[PDB]
Design an enzyme around this catalytic site. Sequence first.
Site, short mmCIF file in Angstrom:
data_model
loop_
_atom_site.label_atom_id
_atom_site.label_comp_id
_atom_site.label_asym_id
_atom_site.label_seq_id
_atom_site.Cartn_x
_atom_site.Cartn_y
_atom_site.Cartn_z
N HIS A 1 39.22 34.98 40.30
CA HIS A 1 40.67 35.15 40.22
C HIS A 1 41.28 34.96 41.60
O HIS A 1 40.72 35.41 42.60
CB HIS A 1 41.04 36.52 39.64
N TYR B 1 37.24 37.91 37.05
CA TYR B 1 37.77 38.63 38.20
C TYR B 1 37.29 38.02 39.52
O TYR B 1 38.06 37.86 40.46
CB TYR B 1 37.37 40.11 38.12
#
Lengths: 104, 100
Positions: free
Chosen positions: A78, A75
């Site tokens: 990302h 994440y």
Amino acid sequence: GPGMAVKHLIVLKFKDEITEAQKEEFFKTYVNLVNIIPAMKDVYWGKDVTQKNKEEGYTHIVEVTFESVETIQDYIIHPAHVGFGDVYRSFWEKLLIFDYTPRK
Amino acid sequence: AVKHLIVLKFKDEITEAQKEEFFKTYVNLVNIIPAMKDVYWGKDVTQKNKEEGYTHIVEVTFESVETIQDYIIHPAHVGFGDVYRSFWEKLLIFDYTPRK
């Protein structure tokens, strides 16, 4: 203990020139990160209706729910990450991110 | 449901015991104020925020924006603020309906 949630709280003021369509697409992409990021289990967001924080000017909230004791580094790197990623980090005039385990 | 969200920074003088007292007392308001639904709180672990920033988050659930205001003006909430406002340096309040 096991199954305790790790939550992120994203607190946002969008730059004046960001459009409503852009904001909507941002929240849509963030909600869909649940499907992409294994440790991410829920995303809910909201628009403040009260506006009582004077000159601080934050308008939107994103609540991200993660499983505990799981890596979330996928994440962090990302492209959609609101703070770090190339896609949306230009969107906000002001941004706060908190990381806490809800308890009572 | 709707969310009453509090982001707070305690005054520098406030001890760990006093933060515990603050949250224990606040969570107990659910036993006193009919309008309140569930309360959760947490401490931010982000090292970036700790020196000068906000440190604690409180989430309160309500049926509607109206019942948030029922809580706001409840005698027990007025009382809480009267004697615990001194604990915080600053705060942010948000009222919103979570959606996905």
